[PDB]
Amino acid sequence: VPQKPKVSLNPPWNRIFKGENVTLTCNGNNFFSTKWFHNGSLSEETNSSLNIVNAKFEDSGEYKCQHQQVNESEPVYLEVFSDWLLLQASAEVVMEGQPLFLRCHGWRNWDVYKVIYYKDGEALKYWYENHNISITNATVEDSGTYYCTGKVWQLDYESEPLNITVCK
């Protein structure tokens, strides 16, 4: 009885804007029939990878993938947004000691400057930043709510806060 399958998204963002694409893939079970469940309803998709093109809020929700008589995977919650700024996260629940990366993602990959992430109101400093993202080794301290800010065109926006937990 091979252990249970696992879903991975490419990109890793489980929070995406309306109109973006994301691919879901069911994990490695053997070297060597797929069944996708969207919000718990068997999908007409049977291939190993589920492609979500031009995301629609309707695509938000839970997802599971299962091989025949091998118990289903752990649920993955996707969520489509519509806003100027969106704080994307590698994962919302991180196992202490693992990597945590964030991303102040602008709509249509718009140029955002003066970016600044914050953990519980306070700015986070010294994360490995790169216009693309910021990373850090997970700590039980890193737990808390996040949200970034940045200037677009000439204005300063702020994203919807986000709740991240580092299970010690």
Ligand SMILES: *[C@@H]1O[C@H](CO)[C@@H](O[C@@H]2O[C@H](CO)[C@@H](O[C@@H]3O[C@H](CO[C@H]4O[C@H](CO)[C@@H](O)[C@H](O)[C@@H]4O)[C@@H](O)[C@H](O[C@H]4O[C@H](CO)[C@@H](O)[C@H](O)[C@@H]4O)[C@@H]3O)[C@H](O)[C@H]2NC(C)=O)[C@H](O)[C@H]1NC(C)=O
């Ligand atoms: C699987 O199950 C999940 C639940 O976990 C469902 O997810 C919900 O899906 C609905 C849409 O079906 C989402 O609600 C929609 O929100 C839109 C925008 O949200 C508001 O907030 C943002 C952020 O502040 C604003 O940008 C935005 O303007 C809104 O203020 C609404 O626009 C939608 O209704 C309106 O727009 C649509 C399309 O334009 C019109 O058709 C409507 O008439 C109306 O004018 C809608 O309310 C909800 O947020 C989702 N929940 C979560 C947590 O993501 C999945 O949809 C479901 N999928 C299936 C197939 O079962």
Ligand SMILES: *[C@@H]1O[C@H](CO[C@@H]2O[C@@H](C)[C@@H](O)[C@@H](O)[C@@H]2O)[C@@H](O[C@@H]2O[C@H](CO)[C@@H](O)[C@H](O)[C@H]2NC(C)=O)[C@H](O)[C@H]1NC(C)=O
């Ligand atoms: C991420 O951090 C963990 C734990 O780091 C500890 O706390 C830091 C502040 C610093 O004081 C470190 O020296 C501490 O060890 C790293 O540790 C690994 O943790 C796993 C279990 O959690 C353990 O089995 C490994 O043996 C640990 N390895 C080491 C070198 O201690 C973890 O490796 C770090 N990951 C990266 C790449 O940063």
Ligand SMILES: *[C@@H]1O[C@H](CO)[C@@H](O[C@@H]2O[C@H](CO)[C@@H](O)[C@H](O)[C@H]2NC(C)=O)[C@H](O)[C@H]1NC(C)=O
């Ligand atoms: C999401 O992926 C789709 C393809 O799956 C992209 O849509 C293509 O867009 C080009 C022009 O931009 C068209 O010529 C193609 O016909 C489209 N493909 C399909 C299958 O319709 C889309 O651009 C991607 N969106 C993002 C945000 O990258």
Ligand SMILES: *[C@@H]1O[C@H](CO)[C@@H](O[C@@H]2O[C@H](CO)[C@@H](O)[C@H](O)[C@H]2NC(C)=O)[C@H](O)[C@H]1NC(C)=O
């Ligand atoms: C994000 O995390 C914060 C803090 O961990 C949560 O807010 C706290 O909620 C408790 C009650 O559950 C309040 O007594 C505290 O005052 C709140 N703290 C702050 C700083 O506001 C919040 O619930 C989490 N967000 C979500 C959606 O779970």
